[PDB]
Design an enzyme around this catalytic site. Structure first.
Site, short mmCIF file in Angstrom:
data_model
loop_
_atom_site.label_atom_id
_atom_site.label_comp_id
_atom_site.label_asym_id
_atom_site.label_seq_id
_atom_site.Cartn_x
_atom_site.Cartn_y
_atom_site.Cartn_z
N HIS A 4 -8.35 1.30 3.11
CA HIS A 4 -7.55 2.18 2.28
C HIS A 4 -6.02 1.89 2.48
O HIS A 4 -5.25 1.76 1.50
CB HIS A 4 -7.87 3.64 2.63
CG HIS A 4 -6.98 4.62 1.94
ND1 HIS A 4 -7.35 5.26 0.79
CD2 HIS A 4 -5.75 5.09 2.25
CE1 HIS A 4 -6.39 6.08 0.41
NE2 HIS A 4 -5.41 6.01 1.29
N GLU A 5 -5.56 1.76 3.73
CA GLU A 5 -4.13 1.62 3.94
C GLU A 5 -3.61 0.26 3.45
O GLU A 5 -2.50 0.17 2.96
CB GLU A 5 -3.76 1.81 5.43
CG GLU A 5 -4.19 3.19 5.95
CD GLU A 5 -3.44 4.33 5.28
OE1 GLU A 5 -2.34 4.14 4.71
OE2 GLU A 5 -3.95 5.46 5.32
N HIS A 31 -2.73 0.37 -0.05
CA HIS A 31 -1.31 0.69 -0.28
C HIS A 31 -0.38 -0.47 0.01
O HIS A 31 0.56 -0.70 -0.74
CB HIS A 31 -0.84 1.89 0.56
CG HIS A 31 -1.59 3.14 0.28
ND1 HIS A 31 -1.76 3.65 -0.99
CD2 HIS A 31 -2.14 4.05 1.14
CE1 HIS A 31 -2.43 4.79 -0.91
NE2 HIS A 31 -2.65 5.06 0.36
N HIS A 78 -2.80 6.24 -5.14
CA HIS A 78 -4.12 6.91 -5.05
C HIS A 78 -4.81 7.02 -6.37
O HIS A 78 -4.19 7.36 -7.38
CB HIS A 78 -3.97 8.30 -4.50
CG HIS A 78 -3.69 8.32 -3.05
ND1 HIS A 78 -2.67 9.07 -2.50
CD2 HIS A 78 -4.29 7.66 -2.02
CE1 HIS A 78 -2.67 8.88 -1.18
NE2 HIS A 78 -3.65 8.04 -0.87
ZN LIG Z 1 -3.72 6.76 0.76
#
Ligand SMILES: [Zn+2]
Ligand SMILES: [Ca+2]
Ligand SMILES: [Ca+2]
Ligand SMILES: [Ca+2]
Ligand SMILES: [Cl-]
Ligand SMILES: [Zn+2]
Length: 168
Positions: free
Chosen positions: A119-120, A123, A129
């Site tokens: 997930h990170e 980014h 998101h």
């Molecule tokens: Zn996030």
């Protein structure tokens, strides 16, 4: 899916990373494995490639931190914020910080380092998101469970490919 405003993205396909330090929660091989797997997830569906640096300056600096740790966004103790990462760009941009007031695990008995790192890194690569509730990029940490058949959502695939294209 969503990107960040003005769609910041890496302007080269080969990115370096460096694991700056290591949590006491886990053996070093398990940190290295989780981060590797997290990068592979995205590698697989774009023409991005990653290599590890052990010295000097890397695009994506990965570190474990507690509370104040040298940016403007201190961590918050156990739970809630688990980690945070900055969108592509020079310096702190691209980097991913992991709150070591969590208990990082190879399984699902604490906080799963692989899933949060995937997930990170999303980014770090330019994805914001997703509205999609099954997307890896959905904000909320949902203890899988069973990470056996984890696979990126299509949505995550659509997001990242819209930035970097599909594999060549
Ligand atoms: Zn996030
Ligand atoms: Ca960076
Ligand atoms: Ca926290
Ligand atoms: Ca910890
Ligand atoms: Cl670095
Ligand atoms: Zn930070």
């Amino acid at each position: 899916f969503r990107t960040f405003p003005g769609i910041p993205k890496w302007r080269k396909t080969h990115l370096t990373y460096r694991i700056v330090n290591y949590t006491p929660d886990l053996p070093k091989d398990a940190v290295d494995s989780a981060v590797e797997k997290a990068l592979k997830v995205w590698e697989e569906v774009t023409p991005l490639t990653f290599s590890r640096l052990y010295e000097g300056e890397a695009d994506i600096m990965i570190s474990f931190a507690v509370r104040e740790h040298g940016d403007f966004y201190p961590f918050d103790g156990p739970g809630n914020v688990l980690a945070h990462a900055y969108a592509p760009g020079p310096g702190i941009n691209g980097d991913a910080h992991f709150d070591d007031d969590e208990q990082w695990t190879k399984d699902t008995t604490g906080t799963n380092l692989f899933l949060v790192a995937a997930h990170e890194i999303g980014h770090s690569l330019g994805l914001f998101h997703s509205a999609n509730t099954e997307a890896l990029m959905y904000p909320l940490y949902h203890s899988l469970t069973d990470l056996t058949r984890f696979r990126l959502s299509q949505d995550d695939i659509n997001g990242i490919q819209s930035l970097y294209g599909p594999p060549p």
